[PDB]
Write an enzyme that holds these catalytic residues in place. Structure first.
Site, short mmCIF file in Angstrom:
data_model
loop_
_atom_site.label_atom_id
_atom_site.label_comp_id
_atom_site.label_asym_id
_atom_site.label_seq_id
_atom_site.Cartn_x
_atom_site.Cartn_y
_atom_site.Cartn_z
N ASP E 12 0.85 -1.07 -0.07
CA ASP E 12 0.09 0.01 0.03
C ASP E 12 0.94 1.38 0.01
N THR E 45 -3.31 4.63 -4.46
CA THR E 45 -2.32 5.69 -3.72
C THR E 45 -0.78 5.36 -4.38
N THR E 46 -0.73 4.34 -5.00
CA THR E 46 0.70 4.44 -5.77
C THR E 46 0.46 4.74 -7.23
N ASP E 348 -8.00 -2.14 1.18
CA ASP E 348 -7.78 -1.55 -0.03
C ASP E 348 -8.94 -2.11 -0.91
F1 BEF Z 1 -0.35 0.08 -3.77
BE1 BEF Z 1 -1.87 0.34 -4.18
F2 BEF Z 1 -2.38 1.66 -3.12
F3 BEF Z 1 -3.01 -0.68 -4.47
#
Ligand code: BEF
Ligand code: ADP
Ligand code: ADP
Ligand code: BEF
Ligand code: BEF
Ligand code: BEF
Ligand code: MG
Ligand code: MG
Ligand code: MG
Ligand code: MG
Lengths: 350, 149, 496, 518, 432
Positions: E12, E45-46, E348
C-alpha cells in the site's frame, strides 16, 4: 569617594564610617581602623574620618622609634598618658556656652553648620541647618532618640525641594477598590490607630466548621458579614475619620470607609505606626471592640500630596509632638543617600 | 501540645468564640494586674491581643530572654518564675529599683539596676574589648578560687 | 534628538522588544550602560521624568556641557569643589532671573487659561512623531487634567487617568472617552450590544458588585455532613433558589446592567439573560473603581446591600468591534464630565501606539505642572539665553576665582540654543549672536529660534511656551548632579 | 572611553540609516512576487516541527520568517495590523511601505535633504492621496442588486493571486452568499471553515444550513426530520453540585446506598424538567454522562454532546434558538427549529448536517482539494475574501483596483507637488513615485515591460481617464469599471495611512541601540 | 523500520510513504496526495504518486522549453477536466448488486499484495461484507462498521468471517469458570458493579463496634442485589465499559456472578459501544434501575476459543431484527507484519467496493485507460494549436507512465509493449 561594591552597589560618599565600611578590610590590623571609625559614628556621628586619620599618623610617628631598638611597650606607656593628658587639655579648654552670649538655637545651628561643610550639601547648608536642627527640637522627649525622626526617601526633585513635616509621612501609598473614591484631604481629623486586619480573616487562626443541617449555612456566612460589621461600625462609632493599621485593610473593608467618607490605609510600616502615635497623640489598639475616644489623634492638615510621581500620605501640623518626619529629595538616587548620611551627621552633633 | 483544631458547629459559636477570646486573656492579664505587678519578663512568646490589654493596664513588658537570662535576672530582683500562668503568687514576685530605657551607643537598651551584677566594659575596637573580658574573667574566677578553698 | 526638529532613537531589549522614542528618559533607561557617570545620568533623566515629565532630554545636555565647561577650567588649574560651588551660586542667579521674568497665567480669565495650557501641550508634543495630529492630541491632554484635578487642592492624580492602547487604523483615530474601556465582552452571547436608558430615567443604572453570582460559601474552611436523603433534597432545592435570590435582588434594585468583580455561574448567566440583564464577567479591581467614579455609582459587597441609590448612571453601554477580526471591547461613555477619564490611543503600528501613549503622558505632564504652577516661560532657547545673559553680566561683578565659573555656567548653557539651531539647520554662532544680541537691543526677554522656519523669532506670537517649574528643575538637577561628580576624585570599582 | 556594556551594538546616524533602509527594502523585496494576478507563492518552512506552508497572504510570510533588523519588524507588524483592521492589503501595505523608504534613501543620499523635511513633505502628500481617494470613491446605495454584483467583484479581485484564481467566480459566490447570509454581523466565527482532504477544489461548497463536527447520543436515530432544538450550557457528566464542600458523613453504609440513588434522582429530575420543554433535539456544549445519554434515547430525544462555546453559538444563530442553562421555566426561553438533521459522510468522517433552517445567520463552508497545503491556503485565501467583503458591509464605498486606485492618488499627489514648491516638493513627488512603483510590480510579475505599461497608464489617468487600470493578462490599459476590478475603500485608505506612518517612524530613526541578548 | 522501532512490510503506497522519512517539503506534499487518494478511494495511492512524478517530469520539459508555469498549471488542470470526462463516458456501469463482476473488481485490487495467494477467498468475503453494510439509498458507506481484529499465529489461510461479533477482551475467570454460554442473552452495562460512592467527597465514619459487622452486611447485600436483578432479567453474559472512572467490577461481586453462572467480560472501550449495541441487538444500560429483559440480547452461542494459546470472544447466531447490520472478520497470520498487511489489503479491496457504491461505474485496467486518455488527449491538442497544445501533448505523453512501469516491473520491453498498445488502441479502443 565613589565606591562600587562587589554586588554593583554604586556609592558616593564623604562619611568616613561609610567609606571605611564599604571597603572590605581583610588585614586584621587594618580592620582596627574600621572599628575605630565605627565607634565614632556610634557615639558622636561626626569625626569618623578624622579618627582614622589620627590613629594611623600615631602609628606612623612611632615607626621612627621602632626602627631603632626600642620596646613598643615603652612607646605605648608614653602614648597612654599622652591621651590621658590630651583629654585633660580639652576639658580645661571646652567652653560652657550657656555662660557666655549665645542664642538658644544658634548653639545647635552654628554647630550643624560646621558638620555640613565638607559634605555635598555644603552649598545648601542654610536650608538643611534650619531644618535638621529644628528636627532635633520636635524630637525632644525629656531624653530623645533618632528612631522617632525617621527619614523617608523619594526619587527625583532638587535636594532643596526637601520638606520638613511637623507630623508624620508615608513613602507608602497602598491602593484598593475604594482608595481613589475616598476623600484624600482633611483638616481636623480623629486618627484611629489600629493593629488587626479588617477583612474576612486573611491570615488569622484557622477553625473548621461542621454543619449538619443546611439552614445553618447562610447562618454561618451571615455570621461572618456580621462579625466584621461590628468590627467596622465599631470604627464609625469612634468619631474617627482616618483609619491606619499595622495589618491589612481589605477590599470589602475599604468599601464602608469609602461611602462613610472615611479615609483608610492598610499594611502600614511597623516603624511608621510608632511614628504616627507619637506625633498624633494616639494609641495603637489591637482590638476594635474596646476603643475609647481616649486613643484617637489629631493634626492641622491631612492630604495625599503627590511628590515625585509617588503618592505620599502627609498628616502634619501637630501642636505638641515628640516626633517628626523628614522627607528628602535629591537629583539621582545616589544623592538621596549621601544627604541622608550627611544629615545623620548633623543631627547627632546637634 | 497536641494539634489545636477549633470545631465551630452553630453560628452562635463564632460571635462568642472570638469575643470570648477577648475576655479569656483579658482575664489572664487581670489576675496579674490585680496582684500589683509593674513588670512582666517574658522568656517565651507574647500575643498581640495579650500585649494590648497589658498595654492598657500600665505595665512594662520585656520579651526575648533565653534560659541564660531568666535565671540571672531571677537572682537580682528576687522573683521565682512559674510555668503555670494561673498562680501569680505575692510570695514569688520580685522587686526592682529602676527599669528604664538607657540608650548606650545609640542602642535602645533596658536596664535592671538595684544578687547578680553586670559590668558594661566600654571601648572602641570590639576586638580588644573581647580580650579584656577574658582579663576580667581571669580575676572573676580568681575570686572564686579564694572562697571555696 | 532635541527639539521639534529632533530625531528618534530605536532601542532593543535583550529579549528583542523594540522601542522607538524621543523621551530622553526612556532612551537612556533602555540602553545597557556601564560607566558609572553614564549610569548616573540615566538616573538624572529618570529623576526629571518623575518630578515633572517633560524636559528629560535637555536635562542631560545641560549637565554634560557643564561638565565640559568644568573640564576646560580644570586643565587650567582650578579646584573642582570651588568650581562646583561657583556653579551653584551661578545656578541660583539663573533661576532668580527666570522667576522675575516669567510670564504668568494666574492673572488670566477662564477663556485665556485653557489656551495657554493648549499652547504648552502644542510645545511639548511638536518634537515626537505625534506632531501630525498635534491639534487633536493636544486638545486631549488639556481635557484630561481639567476633568480630574481637584481645583482648590490643585492636585492631579495620574492613577485616575488610565492609558489604554489598542492597535489599528491611524493615530488620528485616537480618542478620549468620558468613561472606561474594558477588554470584556458580554457574559452571554445572546445579550445585546447597545444598552439604552429606560426613557424616563436619563440614565442606565449599574449593578456594580464584588460578590460572585454563585451560591454563597464561607471564608473559613467547612463541610456539610448530610445523612438524610431528603436533607440533600432540601439542599438541592436551595441551590436554584439562592440563584433566583440574586437575580431578583438586582431586578428589584432597578439596574439595567451588571458589572461584577468576580465571575458568574453557568446557571446564573442564563437567568441574567432571560430577565434582560446584560452582564460583565470578571472585571478588574482598579477598573471597577474607575467605573464607579465615572458613573457616579457605588460599590456593593453582597446582594442584601443592593439598592436603587447605589447604581451607576450611564448615557450608553456598547460592545465595540475594537478590531475587524480581533476582539470586542466594552465602552461605558458619558456626555457629562466624569472624574475618571480613559485615554484610548490607536496607531497603525505597535511601536507608534507605545510612542503615542508616551507623547500624551509627556504632554499631559506639562499641563499638570501648569495647574500646580500657573506660570510660564518661553522656550526655543529664549529662557536659557536670558539666563546666559543674566549670569554673563554678573560674572564681571563677581570677581576673583568665581569669575571663571560664572562665565563657564553661562557659556555651557548656550549649547542648548546652539544645539537647537544645529539640529534645526542654522548656524550655531549666527542664531546665538543674533538672539543674545536682540535680547539686549530690546528690553524683551522672549526671543527664540524659529525652528519651524517662520519669519519672526518672537516666541510669544509663535506659541512656543514652556512651564516655569520645568525650566527651573532642568537646571537645579544638572548643577547638583554636576557638583557631585566634581566632588568625586577618588574612585574604587570592584570586579564583575 | 566605552559607555555601554558588552555585546551591545551602536548603529548611529550614518549606519542607522543603512539598517533602517536595508531592512525595509529587504522585506519589501521578499513579498514583491506575491503582488497581483500573475503573482507567485512562497514556500515557508520551520526548523521546528518538520512543518511548512505554501502561501500568498503577505502577512503570513512576514509574520512567520525570523528577522533581526528592527526596522524590518516594524513593517512586519504594519502587516499584521492591516490583516487585523481589513484582512486584505497585506502585501500592498508592505511594498508601498518599503517603496516610500527606498525613495527616501535616494533623497537622503543623492540629493542631501533633511529627513524631517522629507517627513513634512510625505505628510502633505498623504493627506492629498487620501483626499482624492474619497472624491474618486464609488459609494453604493440602497440598490442591494447593484451592491451584491458589486461585492462579488471585490472578492473576484481579492481572490485572483491565490490558488483560487482559476475558480474565482465559484469562490466569489461562496463568499458573497456567506457574508450576505451572515446578515451584517462582522464576526467571522459564524462561518465555520471545515477543510476535509480530497477531490477537486471546484468541489468546495457553502452548505444550506450547518454541518456539525459532532456525533449522535449513541444507538440514536441517524436522521431527525422536522427538528425542534434545545441548546444548552448545563452540566451533565460532572454531576451538578452546590460549589462549596458538601461532604457525606454516613454513620453506617446503609445511608450511602440511598445517597448514591439520590444523585441519580437529582438527574432523573433535571432531565424531566427538560422533558417538559417538548423537544426532540437536545444539544449541549457540555458532555452528556453515560447515564443521561440513555435517558434521552429512551424518551426519543436526540442528544449531541461536545460542541463548545463555538459550535453552540452558531447553532443558536442558524436554528434561531437560545444558549439555555437553568431549564426551570420552559415558557420564557426561545427554542430552535430546523427541517432535517441527517448525518452525512464526507470522505471518511461523519458530520451531522442541519438542513433547511429557521434563520441562516450562521454558516459552514467545507473546503476541499488535493493537498493539506492547498486546503491551508484555501482557508487563508478565503479569510482574505471573507474580510474585505465583511468590512465592506461596514464600509460600503468602493474604489477601482488594478493599479487605478493608487494611480488616481499618484495623480493628485504629483499635482499637489506642482503647487507646494521647495525641497519638500521633491519629497511630495517621490510619494507619488512610490505609489506608481505599485502597478509597476503588478505588471512586472505578469511579465510585460513594466516601464512601458505603467507609462501607458499614467498618461490616460493624468489625462483624466481615471477609470483606466491594468489588464494583467492582455498587457493593455483597459477600463476597470467595465471589467469590474473593484476594491474596498477601507482597504486602500488603510494601505496609504499605514504606510505613511511607517516611513514617519523609521525616517525619524538615526540611532539603533541593541542590548546584549538574553 | 520505524523511527520508534517497529517493523513494517507493505505494498500500500500511502502506507509506504507515510512510514519512510521524507524530508523535502515539496516531496512531503506527495504523501498528502497519496493520503488524499486513500481518502477518496483507498486504492490507487501508488498510481496517483507516479502520475505526479511523470506530470512533474512533463512540467520540467515544458519549463526547459520556456513556458510560464501559471499557463502550465492551468492547462494541466484543463487536462484533468477533459480526461475525467473521458473516463466517465468510457466506463461501463455496474448493477449495484452484481456479484460476478464486483467480485472480479476486488480480485483485481488484491492481486499485487502478499495476500494474493488467498485472493480466491479474500475477494468475495470482502465484497460479501460491504454490501451487507451498505444500504438501499447507497450513500457513502462507513468502514468503521467492518470489524477487523488481529491475532498472531498460523497462516493467512485461517482468516474467517464470523457470523456475528468478535470481541477484544475475555471472560474474567478470576472467580468461577464461565466461558462458553449456550442459548444466551447478552446484557450490556455502562455502570459499575462495586460498592460504589456518589460523585461527592464521601466517607463512612465509624463510631461503634456494632456498626462494623453491619457495614459488611449491607456491602455484601448491595453487590448481591445487582447480581440478583441481572439473573432476574434473565441474562447469562455481562459486558461492562471502561472503569478508568473509579470502581470497575468487584472481586466480591465476581464470585456472586460466578456461582450465579453469569459470564462476565470487563473493560470495553467507549468507542466500542456504538458498534456492539447494533452488532448484538442489545440496548446499552446505564443505571441498574434500567436493567431489563427488554434491553437484553438473544444470541445463539457465545464461546471463547483458544487460538495459538491466545483466546478470542465469539458471538455466533443473533436473533431479532437487524435494523443495523454489522460484520466481524478475524484475521490470522504467521508473522506479526503479515497480519497488518492482510488488514491493509482487505481495506484496499473493501474500499474498491466502497467506490463502486460511490460512482456505480467500472473501467478496464492494466493501463488501458491511461493509454486511451493519452491517445484521446493527443487528437484534442492537434486541434488546439499554438502554445496550450504542446502542454496537452506532453500531458498525454505522461499518463503513459503507468503502463510503462507496469510493464517494466514485469521485465518487458516497455517500449515494445506501449507502441503496440497504442497502435491496437487506435482501432480496438477501450480494452487494450
Ligand atoms: F499499491 Be496500491 F494503493 F493498490
Ligand atoms: N515649536 C518649537 N519651536 C522652537 N523651539 C521648540 C519648539 N518645540 C520645542 N522647542 C524647544 O526644544 C526643546 C524640546 O526638546 P524635547 O525633544 O521635547 O525634549 P525635552 O523637552 O524632554 O528636553 C525644548 O527645550 C524647547 O525649548
Ligand atoms: N484580476 C485582476 N486584474 C487586475 N488587477 C488585479 C486583479 N486582481 C488583483 N488586482 C490588483 O492586485 C492587488 C492585489 O494583490 P494581492 O497579492 O492580493 O496583494 P494584497 O494581499 O496586498 O491585497 C490589488 O492592488 C488589486 O488592485
Ligand atoms: F567625614 Be565625617 F563622618 F564628618
Ligand atoms: F524629548 Be522630551 F522629554 F519632550
Ligand atoms: F496577498 Be493578499 F493579503 F490579497
Ligand atoms: Mg565632619
Ligand atoms: Mg518636549
Ligand atoms: Mg489582495
Ligand atoms: Mg492496487
Amino acid at each position: 569617594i565613589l565606591i562600587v561594591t562587589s554586588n554593583q552597589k554604586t556609592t558616593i560618599s564623604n562619611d568616613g564610617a561609610t567609606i571605611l565600611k564599604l571597603l572590605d578590610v581583610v588585614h586584621p590590623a587594618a580592620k582596627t581602623l574600621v572599628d575605630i571609625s565605627r565607634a565614632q559614628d556610634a557615639e558622636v556621628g561626626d569625626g569618623t574620618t578624622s579618627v582614622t586619620i589620627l590613629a594611623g599618623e600615631l602609628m606612623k610617628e612611632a615607626k621612627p622609634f621602632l626602627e631603632e631598638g626600642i620596646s613598643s611597650h615603652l612607646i605605648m606607656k608614653g602614648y597612654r598618658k599622652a591621651v590621658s593628658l590630651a583629654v585633660e587639655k580639652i576639658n580645661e579648654l571646652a567652653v560652657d556656652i550657656t555662660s557666655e552670649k549665645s542664642s538658644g538655637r544658634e548653639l545647635l545651628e552654628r554647630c550643624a553648620r560646621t558638620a555640613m561643610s565638607s559634605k555635598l550639601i555644603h552649598n545648601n547648608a542654610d536650608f538643611f541647618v534650619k531644618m535638621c536642627v529644628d528636627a532635633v527640637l520636635s524630637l525632644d522627649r525629656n531624653d530623645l532618640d533618632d528612631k522617632l525622626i525617621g527619614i523617608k526617601k523619594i526619587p527625583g526633585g532638587a535636594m532643596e525641594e526637601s520638606l520638613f513635616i511637623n507630623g508624620v509621612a508615608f513613602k507608602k501609598t497602598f491602593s484598593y477598590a475604594g482608595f481613589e473614591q475616598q476623600p484624600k484631604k482633611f483638616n481636623n481629623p480623629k486618627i484611629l490607630s489600629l493593629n488587626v486586619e479588617l477583612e474576612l480573616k486573611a491570615e488569622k487562626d484557622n477553625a473548621e466548621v461542621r454543619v449538619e443541617h443546611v439552614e445553618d449555612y447562610q447562618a454561618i456566612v451571615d455570621a461572618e458579614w456580621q462579625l466584621i460589621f461590628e468590627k467596622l461600625r465599631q470604627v464609625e462609632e469612634t468619631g474617627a475619620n482616618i483609619v491606619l493599621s499595622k495589618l491589612p485593610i481589605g477590599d470589602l473593608a475599604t468599601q464602608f470607609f469609602a461611602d462613610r467618607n472615611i479615609f483608610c490605609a492598610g499594611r502600614v510600616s511597623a516603624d511608621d505606626m510608632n511614628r504616627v502615635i507619637q506625633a498624633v497623640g494616639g494609641s495603637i489598639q489591637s482590638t476594635t471592640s474596646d476603643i475609647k475616644p481616649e486613643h484617637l489623634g489629631t493634626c492641622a492638615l491631612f492630604e495625599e500630596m503627590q511628590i515625585g510621581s509617588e503618592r505620599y500620605n502627609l498628616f502634619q501640623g501637630c501642636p505638641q509632638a515628640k516626633t517628626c518626619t523628614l522627607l528628602l529629595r535629591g537629583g539621582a538616587e545616589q544623592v538621596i543617600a549621601e544627604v541622608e548620611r550627611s544629615l545623620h551627621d548633623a543631627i547627632m552633633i546637634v | 501540645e497536641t494539634k489545636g483544631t477549633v470545631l465551630l458547629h452553630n453560628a452562635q459559636e463564632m460571635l462568642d468564640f472570638s469575643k470570648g477570646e477577648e475576655k479569656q486573656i483579658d482575664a489572664m492579664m487581670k489576675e496579674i494586674a490585680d496582684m500589683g505587678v509593674e513588670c512582666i519578663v517574658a522568656g517565651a512568646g507574647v500575643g498581640e491581643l495579650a500585649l494590648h490589654y497589658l498595654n492598657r493596664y500600665g505595665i512594662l513588658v520585656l520579651k526575648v530572654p533565653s534560659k541564660f537570662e531568666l535565671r540571672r535576672l531571677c537572682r537580682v530582683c528576687g522573683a521565682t518564675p512559674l510555668p503555670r500562668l494561673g498562680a501569680p503568687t505575692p510570695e514569688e514576685l520580685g522587686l526592682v529599683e529602676t527599669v528604664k530605657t538607657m540608650e548606650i551607643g545609640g542602642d535602645r537598651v533596658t536596664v535592671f539596676k538595684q544578687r547578680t551584677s553586670t559590668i558594661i566594659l566600654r571601648g572602641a575596637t570590639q576586638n580588644n574589648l573581647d580580650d579584656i573580658e577574658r582579663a576580667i574573667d581571669d580575676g572573676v574566677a580568681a575570686v572564686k578560687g579564694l572562697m571555696k578553698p | 534628538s532635541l527639539g521639534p526638529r529632533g530625531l528618534d532613537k530605536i532601542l532593543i531589549s535583550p529579549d528583542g522588544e523594540i522601542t522607538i522614542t524621543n523621551d530622553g528618559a526612556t532612551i537612556l533607561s533602555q540602553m545597557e550602560l556601564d560607566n558609572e557617570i553614564a549610569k548616573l545620568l540615566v538616573q538624572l533623566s529618570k529623576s526629571q521624568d518623575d518630578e515633572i515629565g517633560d524636559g528629560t532630554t535637555g536635562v542631560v545636555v545641560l549637565a554634560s556641557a557643564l561638565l565640559d565647561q568644568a573640564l576646560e577650567l580644570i586643565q587650567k588649574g582650578i579646584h573642582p569643589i570651588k568650581i562646583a560651588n561657583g556653579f551653584d551660586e551661578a545656578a541660583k542667579l539663573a533661576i532668580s532671573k527666570l522667576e522675575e521674568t516669567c510670564d504668568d497665567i494666574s492673572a488670566s480669565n477662564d477663556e485665556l487659561f485653557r489656551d495657554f495650557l493648549l499652547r504648552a501641550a502644542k510645545t511639548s508634543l511638536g518634537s515626537k512623531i505625534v506632531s501630525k495630529d498635534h491639534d487633536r492630541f493636544a486638545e486631549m491632554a488639556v481635557e484630561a487634567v481639567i476633568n480630574v484635578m481637584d481645583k482648590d487642592r490643585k492636585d492631579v492624580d495620574f492613577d485616575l487617568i488610565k492609558m489604554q492602547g489598542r492597535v489599528g487604523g491611524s493615530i488620528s483615530d485616537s480618542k478620549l472617552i468620558n468613561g472606561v474601556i474594558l477588554d470584556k465582552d458580554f457574559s452571554h452571547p445572546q445579550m445585546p450590544k447597545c444598552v439604552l436608558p429606560k426613557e424616563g430615567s436619563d440614565g442606565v443604572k449599574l449593578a456594580i458588585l464584588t460578590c460572585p453570582f454563585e451560591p454563597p460559601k464561607p471564608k473559613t474552611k467547612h463541610k456539610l455532613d448530610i445523612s438524610s436523603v431528603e436533607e440533600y433534597q432540601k439542599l438541592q432545592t436551595y441551590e436554584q433558589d439562592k440563584f433566583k435570590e440574586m437575580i431578583d435582588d438586582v431586578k428589584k434594585a432597578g439596574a439595567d446592567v451588571v458589572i461584577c468583580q468576580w465571575g458568574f455561574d453557568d446557571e446564573a448567566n442564563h437567568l441574567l439573560l432571560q430577565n434582560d440583564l446584560p452582564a460583565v464577567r470578571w472585571v478588574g479591581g482598579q477598573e471597577l473603581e474607575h467605573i464607579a467614579i465615572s458613573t457616579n455609582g457605588r460599590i456593593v459587597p453582597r446582594f442584601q446591600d443592593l439598592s436603587k441609590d447605589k447604581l451607576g448612571t450611564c448615557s450608553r453601554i456598547y460592545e465595540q468591534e475594537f478590531g475587524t477580526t480581533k476582539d470586542r471591547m466594552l465602552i461605558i461613555e458619558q456626555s457629562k464630565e466624569t472624574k475618571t477619564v480613559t485615554c484610548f490611543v490607536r496607531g497603525s503600528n505597535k511601536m507608534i501606539v507605545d510612542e503615542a501613549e508616551r507623547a500624551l503622558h509627556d504632554s499631559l505632564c506639562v499641563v499638570r505642572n501648569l495647574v500646580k504652577d500657573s506660570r510660564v516661560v518661553y522656550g526655543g532657547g529664549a529662557a536659557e539665553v536670558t539666563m546666559s545673559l543674566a549670569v554673563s553680566e554678573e560674572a564681571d561683578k563677581q570677581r576673583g576665582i568665581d569669575q571663571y565659573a560664572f562665565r563657564g555656567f553661562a557659556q555651557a548653557l548656550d549649547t542648548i540654543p546652539m544645539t537647537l539651531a544645529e539640529n534645526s539647520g542654522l548656524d550655531p554662532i549666527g542664531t546665538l549672536s543674533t538672539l543674545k544680541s536682540k535680547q539686549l537691543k530690546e528690553k524683551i526677554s522672549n526671543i527664540g529660534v524659529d525652528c519651524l522656519g517662520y519669519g519672526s523669532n518672537d516666541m510669544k506670537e509663535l506659541f512656543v511656551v514652556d512651564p516655569f517649574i520645568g525650566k527651573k528643575q532642568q537646571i537645579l538637577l544638572a548643577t547638583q548632579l554636576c557638583r557631585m561628580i566634581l566632588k568625586i576624585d577618588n574612585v574604587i570599582i570592584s570586579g564583575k | 572611553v566605552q559607555i555601554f556594556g558588552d555585546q551591545v551594538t551602536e548603529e548611529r546616524a550614518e549606519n542607522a540609516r543603512l539598517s533602517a533602509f536595508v531592512g525595509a527594502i529587504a522585506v519589501g523585496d521578499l513579498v514583491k512576487s506575491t503582488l497581483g494576478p500573475k503573482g507567485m507563492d512562497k514556500l515557508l518552512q520551520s526548523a521546528s516541527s518538520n512543518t511548512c506552508m505554501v502561501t500568498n497572504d503577505g502577512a503570513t510570510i512576514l509574520k512567520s520568517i525570523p528577522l533581526d533588523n528592527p526596522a524590518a519588524k516594524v513593517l512586519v507588524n504594519i502587516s499584521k495590523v492591516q490583516d487585523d483592521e481589513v484582512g486584505d492589503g497585506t502585501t500592498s501595505v508592505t511594498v508601498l511601505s518599503a517603496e516610500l523608504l527606498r525613495e527616501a534613501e535616494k533623497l537622503i543620499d543623492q540629493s542631501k535633504i533633511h529627513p524631517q523635511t522629507i517627513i513634512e513633505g510625505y505628510r502633505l502628500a498623504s493627506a492629498a492621496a487620501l483626499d482624492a481617494l474619497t472624491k474618486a470613491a464609488v459609494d453604493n446605495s440602497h440598490d442591494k442588486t447593484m451592491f451584491r454584483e458589486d461585492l462579488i467583484h471585490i472578492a473576484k479581485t481579492t481572490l485572483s493571486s491565490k490558488i483560487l484564481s482559476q475558480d474565482k467566480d465559484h469562490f466569489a459566490e461562496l463568499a458573497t452568499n456567506a457574508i450576505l447570509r451572515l446578515k451584517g454581523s462582522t464576526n467571522l466565527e459564524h462561518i465555520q471553515i471545515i477543510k476535509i482532504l480530497g477531490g477537486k477544489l471546484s468541489d468546495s461548497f457553502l452548505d444550506e444550513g450547518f454541518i456539525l463536527a459532532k456525533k449522535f447520543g449513541n444507538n440514536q436515530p441517524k436522521r431527525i426530520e422536522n427538528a425542534k432544538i434545545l441548546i444548552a450550557n448545563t452540566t451533565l457528566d460532572t454531576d451538578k453540585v452546590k460549589i462549596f464542600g458538601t461532604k457525606f458523613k454516613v454513620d453506617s453504609t446503609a445511608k450511602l446506598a440511598q445517597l448514591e440513588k439520590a444523585e441519580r434522582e437529582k438527574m432523573k429530575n433535571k432531565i424531566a424538567k427538560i422533558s417538559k420543554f417538548g423537544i426532540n433535539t437536545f444539544i449541549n456544549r457540555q458532555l452528556i454522562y453515560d447515564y443521561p445519554e440513555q435517558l434521552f434515547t429512551d424518551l426519543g430525544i436526540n442528544s449531541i454532546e461536545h460542541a463548545d462555546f463555538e459550535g453552540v453559538e452558531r447553532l443558536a444563530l442558524v436554528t434561531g434558538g437560545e444558549v439555555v442553562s437553568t431549564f426551570d421555566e420552559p415558557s420564557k426561553c426561545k427554542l430552535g427549529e430546523c427541517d432535517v438533521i441527517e448525518e452525512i459522510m464526507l470522505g471518511e468522517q461523519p458530520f451531522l448536517k442541519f438542513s433547511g433552517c429557521k434563520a441562516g445567520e450562521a454558516c459552514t463552508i467545507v473546503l476541499r482539494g488535493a493537498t493539506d497545503q492547498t486546503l491551508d491556503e484555501a482557508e487563508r485565501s478565503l479569510h482574505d475574501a471573507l474580510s474585505v467583503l465583511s468590512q465592506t458591509t461596514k464600509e460600503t464605498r468602493t474604489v477601482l483596483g488594478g493599479g487605478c486606485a493608487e494611480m488616481v492618488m499618484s495623480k493628485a499627489v504629483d499635482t499637489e507637488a506642482q503647487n507646494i514648491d521647495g525641497k519638500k516638493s521633491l519629497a511630495v513627488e517621490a510619494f507619488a513615485r512610490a505609489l506608481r512603483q505599485l502597478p509597476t510590480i503588478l505588471a512586472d510579475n505578469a511579465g510585460f515591460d513594466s516601464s512601458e505599461l505603467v507609462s501607458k497608464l499614467r498618461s490616460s489617468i493624468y489625462n483624466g481617464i481615471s477609470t483606466s487600470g491594468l489588464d494583467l493578462n492582455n498587457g493593455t490599459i483597459a477600463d476597470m469599471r467595465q471589467l469590474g476590478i473593484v476594491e474596498s475603500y477601507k482597504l486602500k485608505r488603510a494601505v496609504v495611512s499605514s504606510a505613511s506612518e511607517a516611513a514617519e517612524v523609521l525616517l525619524r530613526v538615526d540611532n539603533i541601540i541593541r542590548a546584549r541578548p538574553r | 523500520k520505524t523511527s520508534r522501532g517497529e517493523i513494517i512490510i507493505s505494498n500500500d503506497g500511502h502506507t509506504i510513504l507515510k512510514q519512510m522519512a521524507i524530508l523535502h517539503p515539496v516531496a512531503r506534499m506527495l504523501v498528502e496526495v497519496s493520503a488524499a487518494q486513500d481518502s477518496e478511494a483507498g486504492d490507487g495511492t501508488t498510481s496517483v504518486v507516479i502520475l505526479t512524478g511523470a506530470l512533474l517530469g512533463a512540467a520540467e520539459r515544458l519549463l526547459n522549453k520556456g513556458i510560464h508555469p501559471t499557463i502550465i498549471a492551468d492547462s494541466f488542470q484543463s487536462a484533468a477536466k477533459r480526461s475525467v470526462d473521458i473516463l466517465l463516458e468510457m466506463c461501463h456501469k455496474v448493477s449495484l448488486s452484481d456479484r460476478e463482476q464486483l467480485v472480479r473488481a476486488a480480485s483485481t485490487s488484491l492481486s499485487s499484495k502478499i495476500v494474493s495467494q488467498y485472493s480466491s477467498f479474500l475477494a468475495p468475503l470482502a465484497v460479501d461484507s460491504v454490501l451487507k453494510i451498505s444500504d438501499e439509498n447507497s450513500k457513502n458507506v462507513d468502514l468503521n462498521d467492518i470489524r477487523l481484529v488481529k491475532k498472531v499465529g498460523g497462516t493467512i489461510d485461517d482468516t474467517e468471517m464470523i457470523d456475528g461479533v468478535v470481541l477484544t477482551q475475555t471472560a474474567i475467570k478470576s472467580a468461577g469458570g464461565p466461558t462458553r454460554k449456550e442459548k444466551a442473552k447478552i446484557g450490556l452495562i455502562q455502570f459499575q458493579i462495586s460498592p460504589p460512592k456518589p460523585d461527592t467527597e464521601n466517607n463512612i465514619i465509624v463510631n461503634d463496634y456494632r456498626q462494623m459487622d453491619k457495614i459488611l452486611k449491607e456491602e455484601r447485600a448491595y453487590l448481591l442485589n445487582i447480581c440478583k436483578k441481572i439473573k432476574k432479567a434473565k441474562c447469562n453474559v455481562l459486558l461492562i465499559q471502561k472503569s478508568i472512572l473509579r470502581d470497575a467490577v468487584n472481586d466480591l461481586a465476581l464470585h456472586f456472578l460466578s456461582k450465579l453462572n453469569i459470564m462476565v467480560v470487563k473493560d470495553i472501550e467507549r468507542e466500542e459501544i456504538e458498534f456492539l449495541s447494533k452488532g448484538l441487538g442489545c440496548k446499552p444500560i446505564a443505571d441498574i434501575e434500567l436493567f431489563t429483559e427488554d434491553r437484553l440480547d438473544s444470541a445463539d452461542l457465545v464461546e471463547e476459543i483458544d487460538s495459538d494459546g491466545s483466546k478470542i470472544v465469539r458471538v455466533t447466531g443473533i436473533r431479532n431484527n437487524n435494523a443495523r447490520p454489522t460484520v466481524s472478520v478475524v484475521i490470522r497470520g504467521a508473522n506479526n507484519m503479515i497480519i497488518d498487511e492482510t488488514e491493509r489489503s482487505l481495506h484496499d479491496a473493501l474500499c474498491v467496493i466502497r467506490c463502486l457504491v460511490k460512482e456505480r461505474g467500472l473501467i478496464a485496467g492494466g493501463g488501458a485507460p491511461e493509454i486511451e486518455i493519452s491517445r484521446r488527449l493527443s487528437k484534442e491538442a492537434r486541434s488546439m494549436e499554438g502554445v496550450q497544445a504542446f502542454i496537452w501533448q506532453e500531458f498525454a505523453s505522461a499518463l503513459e507512465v503507468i503502463p510503462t512501469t507496469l510493464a517494466e516491473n514485469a521485465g518487458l520491453n516497455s517500449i515494445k509493449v506501449v507502441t503496440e498498445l497504442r497502435s491496437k488502441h487506435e482501432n480496438g479502443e477501450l480494452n487494450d
